[PDB]
């Protein structure tokens, strides 16, 4: 479904970021679009890439030069650990910084509220409020619950992304 709408001749660049241990690597792997490749453009800055035909997913941790990899980004996936209540405030701050990058002003926002399987995970209502998504203007956004370990939610989120480019 989403694969159909994303594939083509023109490069499709997706940025997936979030705090460490949000589940970003696990998501890449569960997509099955090919090998996860790690590069280190500078020491301490680990970048994971999955490239399949015209589609690129670029992943790194935030909250710990970036502007280079923002070129022609069409979507931001922001992954949050729904169970990490102590760092939701940090996640909000890093998301908002991403969102005032002019280079990516026309990128749509998909939020994965990940680790939905966990007994004290925040609800999608809670995650949406605490990330301040309602405050977003002039950008399409969606927040989608996910479990990156069984893959629940991932295709639903990507389907929305593909439909709204």
Select from 59, 60, 14 the least CA-distant residue to 162. 14
Task: List the x/- string, 112-131, binding to ligand GDP by CB under 6 A.
Answer: --xx-xx-------------
Select from 100, 66, 88 the least CA-distant residue to 111. 88
User: Distance between CA 38 and CA 41 in Å, rounded?
Assistant: 10
147 interacts with, out of ligand GDP, a second copy, Mg ion, none, CB within 5 to 8 A per kind: ligand GDP
Quick check: 23 binds ligand GDP (CB under 6 A)?
A: yes
Quick check: 21 binds ligand GDP (CB under 6 A)?
A: yes
3-state SS assignment for residue 115: coil
* Residues at the interface with a second copy (CB under 8 A): 25-26, 29, 35-40, 43, 46, 48, 148-149
User: Is residue 25 annotated as involved in ligand binding?
Assistant: yes
Q: What 8-state DSSP symbol labels residue 147?
A: B
User: Is residue 64 annotated as involved in ligand binding?
Assistant: yes
User: Distance between CA 111 and CA 145 in Å, rounded?
Assistant: 8
Kindly list the residues in this chain that would bind ligand GDP in the complex (CB under 6 A). 18, 20-26, 43-44, 46, 114-115, 117-118, 147-149
């Amino acid at each position: 479904s989403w694969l159909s709408k994303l594939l083509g001749k023109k490069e499709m660049r997706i940025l997936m970021v979030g705090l460490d241990a949000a589940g970003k690597t696990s998501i890449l792997y569960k997509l099955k679009l090919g090998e996860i490749v790690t590069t280190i453009p500078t020491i301490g800055f680990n970048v994971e890439t999955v490239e399949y035909k015209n589609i690129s997913f670029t992943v790194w941790d935030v909250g710990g030069l970036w502007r280079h990899y923002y070129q022609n980004t069409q979507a931001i996936i922001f992954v949050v650990d729904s169970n990490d209540r102590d760092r939701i405030g940090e996640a909000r701050e890093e998301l908002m910084k991403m969102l005032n990058e002019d280079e990516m002003r026309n990128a749509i926002l998909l939020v994965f509220a990940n680790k939905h399987d966990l007994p004290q995970a925040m609800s999608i209502s809670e995650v949406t409020e605490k990330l301040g998504l309602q405050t977003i203007k002039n950008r399409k956004w969606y927040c989608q619950t996910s479990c990156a370990t069984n893959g629940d939610g991932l295709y639903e989120g990507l389907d929305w992304l593909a439909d709204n480019l």
